[PDB]
């Protein structure tokens, strides 16, 4: 029904933007899709009514992708890093969501990355500490 159609549409939108930015990074063309769309998409990802459908449809995979390094090893613009970590903090994420998505692995990297801003590192650390609770029930 409608809530699944909405969530699947948003998932595809995030996938398409990621693929295009990654292709453009390899090609040497501007890779501005994430930055141009992050505010809008992040607002939708915050919807409490959409949340469970989004998690059920594997949206953590696309969030992880958007936080991951570009093909040339560079990181996404810090505005993306900050806003997506803010999104993740708001979601009721449980063990099964984390195991299937692996989003913990990129957030873990943010928490230890020496190049990262102190603020983003601290945000990631807090998110790792929150999700560590899912290990202990």
């Amino acid at each position: 029904g409608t809530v699944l159609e909405i969530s699947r549409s948003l998932k595809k939108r995030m996938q398409d933007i990621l693929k295009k930015d990654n292709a453009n990074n390899l090609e040497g063309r501007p890779a501005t899709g994430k930055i141009e769309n992050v505010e809008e998409i992040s607002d939708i990802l915050m919807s409490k009514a959409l949340q469970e459908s989004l998690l059920d449809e594997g949206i953590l995979d696309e969030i992880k992708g958007w936080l991951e390094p570009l093909p040339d090893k560079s990181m996404p613009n810090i505005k993306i890093r900050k806003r997506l970590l803010d999104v993740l903090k708001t979601m009721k994420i449980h063990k099964e969501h984390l195991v299937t998505s692996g989003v913990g692995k990129i957030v873990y990297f943010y928490s230890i990355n020496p190049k990262e801003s102190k603020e983003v590192r601290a945000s990631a650390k807090a998110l790792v500490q929150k999700w560590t609770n899912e290990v202990f029930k």
Partner: peptide
């Protein structure tokens, strides 16, 4: 608590910090 088993679940989730080391 069996901490060995908790650690194994911790690794399923967070891996071992190696995943993106290539970046540095």
């Amino acid at each position: 608590i069996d901490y060995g088993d908790r650690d194994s679940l911790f690794f399923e989730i967070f891996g071992t910090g190696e995943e993106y080391r290539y970046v540095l």
